[PDB]
Design an enzyme around this catalytic site. Structure first.
Site, PDB file in Angstrom:
ATOM      1  N   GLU A  63       0.792  -1.248   0.136  1.00 31.48           N
ATOM      2  CA  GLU A  63      -0.125   0.094  -0.106  1.00 31.48           C
ATOM      3  C   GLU A  63       1.034   1.302   0.053  1.00 31.48           C
ATOM      4  OE1 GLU A  63      -1.972   1.077   3.491  1.00 31.48           O
ATOM      5  OE2 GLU A  63      -3.877   1.785   2.407  1.00 31.48           O
ATOM      6  N   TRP A  97      -8.176  -1.855  -0.585  1.00 31.13           N
ATOM      7  CA  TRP A  97      -8.914  -0.723  -1.410  1.00 31.13           C
ATOM      8  C   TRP A  97      -9.922  -0.848  -2.101  1.00 31.13           C
ATOM      9  CZ3 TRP A  97      -8.589   4.500  -0.700  1.00 31.13           C
ATOM     10  CH2 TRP A  97      -7.719   5.255   0.295  1.00 31.13           C
ATOM     11  N   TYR A 124      -4.588   9.866  -1.097  1.00 36.28           N
ATOM     12  CA  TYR A 124      -3.155  10.054  -0.545  1.00 36.28           C
ATOM     13  C   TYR A 124      -2.038  10.061  -1.402  1.00 36.28           C
ATOM     14  CZ  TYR A 124      -5.495   8.115   3.505  1.00 36.28           C
ATOM     15  OH  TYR A 124      -6.490   7.900   4.519  1.00 36.28           O
ATOM     16  N   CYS A 168      -7.461  10.028   6.169  1.00 37.93           N
ATOM     17  CA  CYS A 168      -7.306   9.539   7.409  1.00 37.93           C
ATOM     18  C   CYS A 168      -6.092   9.892   8.046  1.00 37.93           C
ATOM     19  CB  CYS A 168      -7.980   8.204   7.907  1.00 37.93           C
ATOM     20  SG  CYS A 168      -9.494   7.981   7.829  1.00 37.93           S
ATOM     21  N   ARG A 183      -6.498  12.011  11.525  1.00 35.48           N
ATOM     22  CA  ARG A 183      -7.731  12.716  12.094  1.00 35.48           C
ATOM     23  C   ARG A 183      -8.594  11.691  12.590  1.00 35.48           C
ATOM     24  NH1 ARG A 183     -12.131  11.091   9.240  1.00 35.48           N
ATOM     25  NH2 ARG A 183     -11.690  10.431   7.206  1.00 35.48           N
ATOM     26  N   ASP A 200      -9.466   4.095  13.530  1.00 32.14           N
ATOM     27  CA  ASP A 200     -10.024   2.838  13.999  1.00 32.14           C
ATOM     28  C   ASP A 200      -8.840   1.907  14.800  1.00 32.14           C
ATOM     29  OD1 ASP A 200     -10.699  -0.084  14.245  1.00 32.14           O
ATOM     30  OD2 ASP A 200     -11.834  -0.219  12.193  1.00 32.14           O
TER      31      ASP A 200
END
Ligand SMILES: O=c1[nH]c(=O)n([C@H]2C[C@H](O)[C@@H](COP(=O)(O)O)O2)cc1F
Ligand SMILES: O=c1[nH]c(=O)n([C@H]2C[C@H](O)[C@@H](COP(=O)(O)O)O2)cc1F
Lengths: 261, 258
Positions: free
Chosen positions: B55, B77, B91, B143, B163, B166
């Site tokens: 990733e 994804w 990103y 995120c 921000r 999980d």
């Protein structure tokens, strides 16, 4: 009460890494440090030295106006931005311009302050309630890259919390002012959103004490804090309608200001 | 030191409950890892580092399409992709090509490396994915939004602002990912590694992860593995095979609930 700021100040004074920037300026610094204040217990205007709240409040209202010219600050005797202004008092598209009108590719302009307030009122649990000044493509136009670069709000049990990310932190001159500024903003946002205040969290990147501040820092560290003052706000129907006279800092009992180069 | 497990426990025990999937949450929390003492791939469960590494390489390509990720057996994804595999300018697109007003595109990764090499004391070594005007075009808002580099005594530190977190599913990825990125940047800037600081906004445990968390929290943490990177002339030329994790001896993987 407690002294998150003084503790961090001391910590960097005592364990910080030495540096010099070729000009010979000199700093002691740590990276990635964090302070929290419980706003419900008192307003975090430092009492170990007088902090000039007048400038804090005016600068914030100026940001909230979305203003980019120091003119309005000057009218009210605030001179903190004077050093960096153009011959016409312009500063480029800094905080105010980004907070109130970040330019999108679609041609639209985004008022992040109103957007955040709308989320706080309609979707308080959102994890996306964010305001950024770090507009990568516009930084070079700004007089200086944004220091207090972005912040996020959070709501729990009807209380509003705010966290600031500050990329660079002059712990002696800047941070006390920064803390007051974002704490004040948090009270304004809370009142406008129909919430009570929760915590303010300050997260710094490069947290430094300038070598020429060291004596000032030791004097301050030798002082005992008083209780934090109480922040009061007059009623307004919009955050953009707050004026300086709407703000009272009640029972502020600081030790004397410390003047530093 | 096990900041992750400590934070996970802190939130489980003191997080305020919400709805509505349902969570326990705390706001504004921070972890720090000393990268010089070990690579922060959790050992209290087997983390799928293969997905983490691919990733990250994919972010570095500045790709808006899942294809390269998907064809390497990484499917995290897939659910968010369009018909064509597209995600919008997420990103990596912001990292490598933030669109400036001039029509120019800003490569924040190369610019950050530039500062680390020529002006390592800079307090502006920042990469942001939080492109306010483009977030509506993204499949989902960033995120892990914003990160900063810092250099002291030849050691590179990195702080991430995340921000939304999980804690059970996302954070172990986020931690390993940025730690790995920090190794790549350090190696390319000719520095050794310092600290990774993780700062979280909304830190939450989903109600449907509670049993998995309690299981993870009942396990004794083990010594962290070590990371080794083969040599490369450019961060954009690292491959999966360049990335070697040694002495990784985790407890069993814990399946993400359906
Ligand atoms: O709201 C602010 N707070 C603050 O502390 N600074 C300080 C930090 C630093 O010492 C200097 C900014 O310089 P630089 O851009 O190199 O970080 O001003 C600036 C602003
Ligand atoms: O790199 C990532 N890490 C992470 O933890 N999330 C999680 C956080 C949150 O639980 C969810 C995103 O949803 P939201 O946008 O509402 O915060 O995915 C996403 C991504």
């Amino acid at each position: 009460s407690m002294t998150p700021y003084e503790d961090l100040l001391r910590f960097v004074l005592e364990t910080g890494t030495p540096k010099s920037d070729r000009t010979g300026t000199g700093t002691r610094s740590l990276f990635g440090q964090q302070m929290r204040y419980d706003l419900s217990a008192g307003f975090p205007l430092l009492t170990t030295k007088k902090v000039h709240f007048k400038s804090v409040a005016y600068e914030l209202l100026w940001f909230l106006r979305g203003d980019s010219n120091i003119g309005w600050l000057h009218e009210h005797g605030v001179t903190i931005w004077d050093e960096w202004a153009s011959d016409t008092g312009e500063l480029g598209p800094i905080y105010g311009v980004q907070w109130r009108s970040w330019p999108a590719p679609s041609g639209e302009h985004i008022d992040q302050i109103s957007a955040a307030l709308d989320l706080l009122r309609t979707d308080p649990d959102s994890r996306r309630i964010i305001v950024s000044a770090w507009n990568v493509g516009e930084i070079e136009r700004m007089a200086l890259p944004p220091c207090h670069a972005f912040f996020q709000f959070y709501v729990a049990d009807g209380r509003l919390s705010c966290q600031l990310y500050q990329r660079s932190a002059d712990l002696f001159l800047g941070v006390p002012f920064n803390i007051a500024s974002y704490a004040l903003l948090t009270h304004m946002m809370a009142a406008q959103a129909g919430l009570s205040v929760g915590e303010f969290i300050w997260t710094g990147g490069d947290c430094h004490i300038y070598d020429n501040h060291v004596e000032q820092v030791r004097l301050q560290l030798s002082r005992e804090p008083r209780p934090y003052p109480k922040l009061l706000l007059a009623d307004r129907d919009s955050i953009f309608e707050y004026t300086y006279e709407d703000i009272v800092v009640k029972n502020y009992d600081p030790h004397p200001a410390i003047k530093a180069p």
